Amino acid sequence: NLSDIIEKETGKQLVIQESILMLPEEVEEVIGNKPESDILVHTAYDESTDENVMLLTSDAPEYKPWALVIQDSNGENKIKML
C-alpha cells in the first residue's frame, strides 16, 4: 500500500490523513520539477518529529510514486524524487 511505501522510506509507520489532488503546474511551482500528470498529495503527520510527510503519486488508480516531500516546523520542504 502507499503507507508501507512511506514506512519503507522513513522507517516510521505513518497514517495517511488526507490525499489532495493537484495539477501538474500547481505542483511544479512547489516542487521545481513539473510532473507530467495530476498529483495526489498523500499527507500524514509525524507528531514525533513534528513533520508533514507527503507521498506524491499519480492519479488513481495506478498511483505511481513520483516524490516524497518532508516539511519541518520552520516550513522547509525536503523533496526526494522516486
Add this chain to the structure above:
Amino acid sequence: MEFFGESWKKHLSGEFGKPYFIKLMGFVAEERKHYTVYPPPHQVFTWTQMCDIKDVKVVILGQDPYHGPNQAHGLCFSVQRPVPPPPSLENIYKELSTDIEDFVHPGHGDLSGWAKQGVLLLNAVLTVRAHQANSHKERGWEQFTDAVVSWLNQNSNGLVFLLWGSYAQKKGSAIDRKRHHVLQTAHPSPLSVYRGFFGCRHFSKTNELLQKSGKKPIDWKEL
C-alpha cells in the same frame, strides 16, 4: 431520495431521473457490498440537512471524501469527533487564528457549526472506497455537483465562493463574478500552504462582503 434535505430536493429533483444518476446510484450501491465505502448512506448528503438551500451564503468546494474510518461524514474538510484535524484543516485553523480576532482552535475538526450558518461545504465527488483516494471519480458525482453549483450560480445572489487550489478553481470557472464574489488562492495542504493560503485572510474578507451585501457574517468560532 432518502437522507436528502427537502428544500434541496425540491430544487435538484430533476437530477435523480437522469440516466447518469441512475447509473451512479447503481455503481455506488454495487460497491457497498464488496468495498467499504465512505461516507455511510445517512451521511452522503449531510450538506443538504445542515441548512436550507435558500440560507446558503458561503460555498467552499472540496474534492472527494476522506478515505479512512471515522473521518468523512458528508462535509468537505470536516472530520467527525474524535478524529483529530487532518493537515489541511489544521492550516485552515491556523489561518483563521490570525485572521479572525475572536477565533479559538476548537480542539475538534467537525465543521457542522459552519454548515448550520449557511456555509456549504461541498465535495465534488461524494463517495470513496476506504483507502483509495479519488477512487469514485468519473462515476457521475462531478456532474451532479456541477448541477448543484450551477443552480446556486443562477438562482442565488451575492454568495461568496472560496476556491482553494486549481481543482476547486476549475470547478468554479463558470461562476458569475458579477453576481457572486469569488476568492481563490492555493490549497491549505502543507505542500501549497505557503504558496498563498497563509495570509489570504479569506474569512475576514468573506464577512466583509456579506455585511456589505446585507447578510449576517459567519461566526467562524462557532464550531
